[PDB]
C-alpha cells in the first residue's frame, strides 16, 4: 500500500479513543485556538473601546473584575463590519485597544461548531446508524450563529453582537428588549413554549419510566444496580405505566408506541429553538413585534391605558439611558 492509504485508514478508524474523521481536521485546530485565545483574553486583556467614543471598558480579571462581571468586549464601533486580523494593525497594542480578540474567537468558534455537526454525521455513518442526530444539534448552532453573526450583519457592526460574558448577556437582552420589543414576537413565545414543554416532558418521561421498574434489588443497595449493560427490557412496564397515564388524564391520551413517543420528544424543543432563532434573525432587519400602544379610547377621544402601555413605559426608561454619550441626534436609526 501507499502512504496516503495508510493515512486515510488511520484518519477514519473507529478504534481511536476519540473519532477524528475528515471534519475533525477543520474542527480541532479552530476550537483549540479559540479556547486558547478566550482563556488568555479573559484573564489578562486590557480595556477595550467598544463604542468608538474613546471610552474604554474593562473586562478582564486582572483589571478589577470578578467571574460574574468579566467578559470579552466586542470590537469597536469605528471598525464596523470590516475584517480586522492581527496583521492589519500597526502594533499588537492597537489591536488590543480596538477589540481584536472578539473577531478571532467568534470566527474560529463558528467554524468549529459547523465541523462538530459534520463530525457527528460522519461517525453516525461509519457506525452503521441512521443519520439524523446532527439535524437535532443544528438548532443550538443556528441560535448561536443567529446572534453572533447575523445580528451584526443586519445592524452593520460587530459591536452590536453579544459579549462573551455573563453580565454582557443581560445587557444584550435588556437593550434588545428596549429596541425591538421582543416578548411580543410570536416566535419568542414559540421558543418559550418549547423550553417549558421540553422540561415538562423530560420530567414526565423520567417519572413514568422510573416508577415502572421491576424488582431485582430488595433494600440494601441502590436500585440502579438492577440494570446490566446489555440487558433486554423495554423502557417501561406496559400495564402499570399505561394504566397510570390513562387514569391520570382522559383515557384517549396515552402513547402506546415508543417510536412515536421518542419522536415527539425529539421534535418539540428542536422546532421551538428553530423558530426562536429565526425570530432573532428576522428582528435583526428591523421587523419588530406587535405594537398595541394607545389602542383603546373612550367616546370623546381620550386614551385609556392597558398593560402594553406599562411595558412601553419600561421600554422608554431602558432606551433613554443606554449608551448615554453615544447619540447626537433625536432618532436612534
Amino acid at each position: 500500500v501507499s502512504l496516503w492509504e495508510r493515512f486515510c485508514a488511520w484518519i477514519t478508524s473507529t478504534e481511536n479513543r476519540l473519532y477524528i474523521g475528515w471534519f475533525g481536521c477543520l474542527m480541532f485546530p479552530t476550537l483549540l485556538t479559540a479556547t486558547s485565545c478566550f482563556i488568555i483574553a479573559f484573564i489578562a486583556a486590557p480595556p477595550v473601546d467598544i463604542d468608538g467614543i474613546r471610552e474604554p471598558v474593562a473586562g478582564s480579571l486582572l483589571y478589577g473584575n470578578n467571574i460574574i462581571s468579566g467578559a470579552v468586549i466586542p470590537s469597536s464601533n469605528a471598525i464596523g463590519m470590516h475584517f480586522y486580523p492581527i496583521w492589519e494593525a500597526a502594533s499588537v497594542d492597537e489591536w488590543l485597544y480596538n477589540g481584536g480578540p472578539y473577531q478571532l474567537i467568534v470566527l474560529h468558534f463558528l467554524l468549529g461548531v459547523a465541523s462538530y455537526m459534520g463530525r457527528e454525521w460522519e461517525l453516525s455513518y461509519r457506525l452503521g446508524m441512521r443519520p439524523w442526530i446532527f439535524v437535532a444539534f443544528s438548532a443550538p448552532v443556528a441560535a448561536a450563529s443567529a446572534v453572533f453573526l447575523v445580528y451584526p450583519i443586519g445592524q452593520g457592526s460587530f459591536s452590536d453582537g453579544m459579549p462573551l460574558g455573563i453580565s454582557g448577556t443581560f445587557n444584550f437582552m435588556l437593550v434588545f428588549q428596549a429596541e425591538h420589543n421582543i416578548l411580543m414576537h410570536p416566535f419568542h413565545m414559540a421558543g418559550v413554549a418549547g423550553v417549558f414543554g421540553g422540561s415538562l416532558f423530560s420530567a414526565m418521561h423520567g417519572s413514568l419510566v422510573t416508577s415502572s421498574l421491576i424488582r431485582e434489588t430488595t433494600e440494601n443497595e441502590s436500585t440502579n444496580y438492577g440494570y446490566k449493560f446489555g440487558q433486554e427490557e423495554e423502557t417501561y412496564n406496559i400495564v402499570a405505566a399505561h394504566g397510570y397515564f390513562g387514569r391520570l388524564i382522559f383515557q384517549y391520551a396515552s402513547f402506546n408506541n415508543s417510536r412515536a413517543l421518542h419522536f415527539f420528544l425529539a421534535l418539540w424543543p428542536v422546532l421551538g429553538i428553530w423558530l426562536t432563532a429565526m425570530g432573532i434573525s428576522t428582528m435583526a432587519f428591523n421587523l419588530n413585534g406587535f405594537n398595541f400602544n394607545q389602542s383603546v379610547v373612550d367616546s370623546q377621544g381620550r386614551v385609556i391605558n392597558t398593560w402594553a402601555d406599562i411595558i412601553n413605559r419600561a421600554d422608554l426608561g431602558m432606551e433613554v439611558m443606554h449608551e448615554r454619550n453615544a447619540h447626537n441626534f433625536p432618532l436612534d436609526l
Binding site: 484573564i43 480579571l61 486582572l62 470578578n66 467571574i67 449493560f229
Partner: peptide, 28 residues
C-alpha cells in the same frame, strides 16, 4: 488578590473534567 482564587477554581474545574474524560471506569 482574588484573581488567584478565581484562576485556581477555574483550573481545578478543568483538571476535574480532564480526569473524568480520560481516566474513567470502563463501561463493561
Amino acid at each position: 488578590m482574588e484573581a488567584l482564587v478565581y484562576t485556581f477554581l477555574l483550573i481545578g474545574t478543568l483538571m476535574v473534567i480532564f480526569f473524568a474524560v480520560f481516566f474513567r471506569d470502563t463501561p463493561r
